[PDB]
Amino acid sequence: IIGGSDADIKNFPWQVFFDNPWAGGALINEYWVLTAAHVVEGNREPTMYVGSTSVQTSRLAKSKMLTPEHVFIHPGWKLLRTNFDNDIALVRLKDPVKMGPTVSPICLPGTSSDYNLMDGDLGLISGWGRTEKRDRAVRLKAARLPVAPLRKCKEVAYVFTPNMICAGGEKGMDSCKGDSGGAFAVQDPNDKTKFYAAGLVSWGPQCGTYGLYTRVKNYVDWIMKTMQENSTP
């Protein structure tokens, strides 16, 4: 996160830390983590941590580690010159995550038009990715971003689809390398005490301006179907 501020894991208790490669995810219930397809593509058994503000090697060894059972990549990922459409994946966990003050899931978008992001909407991004100071952040960073017209992400060869949200532009705040898979947390218009995952950090130009996020609303049916089809008996 560039241009951001210190954040406690309690501010983003759904934030998952992926290591090797360095990335993020979003806990969406006790057995499932949401992230970007390109994060787990050749990383089918990802190292995951939750519940900690810091990712210092010393602190990781004392943190809750999540045990992956199976990674489900979206069928449209790399199906069809760079094209990052359907950059979304689900990690099923072996064990149920215990929820508490530092660990709890984020909501999914609803299917109604109330969850169609457009001009006026705002989101939070969070992660341990590159900042202005270093290529990786040891303590969690976060920033508030506005949704932006897609036209502004494509300036200064690449495929921009309606499955992508453009955001940023204000005060240089943006997500950078190391933030992929992290949730673009947006206030739920029907329950304003709750946040939901409207987007996942995916890709974009060199960070500091705008970026593209996987529009989660278009995958809710696939996410629901995958979770139901891979139940917990």
């Binding site: 490669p21 360095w22 590159r130 997500s175 890709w203």
Partner: protein, 115 residues
């Protein structure tokens, strides 16, 4: 173009810049993998970017353990990571920064981090 006056960092309008007492100023931060020769890009003010000539800088926002795989131009791939072997292949570090084979990044060993 000419440099703008800066009250805070937000006023400079670019992360390639940094503000001071004589209010903005060209930031020449150490580049992660740097550029070969004199192949760096520069902005409207002519400040050195951390992006090589011919490169668009577009990429997935994944944190590569050994850094992004970079070509002979200094262009980082869109979403390809280095292996432990190409971690220090195509990188340009100047003393006291040397390529760290464990991160694929220009680093000063003497440097002490606060955490």
């Amino acid at each position: 173009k000419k440099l703008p006056k800066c009250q805070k960092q937000e006023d400079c309008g670019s992360w390639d810049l940094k503000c001071n007492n004589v209010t903005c100023e060209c930031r020449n931060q150490v580049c992660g993998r740097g550029c070969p020769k004199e192949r760096y890009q520069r902005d409207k003010y002519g400040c050195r970017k951390c992006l090589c000539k011919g490169c668009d800088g577009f990429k997935c926002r994944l944190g590569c353990t050994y850094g992004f795989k970079t070509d002979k131009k200094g262009c980082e791939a869109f979403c390809t990571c280095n292996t432990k072997e190409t971690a220090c292949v195509n990188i340009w570090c100047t003393d006291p920064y040397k390529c760290n084979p464990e991160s694929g990044r220009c680093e000063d060993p003497n440097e002490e981090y606060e955490y």
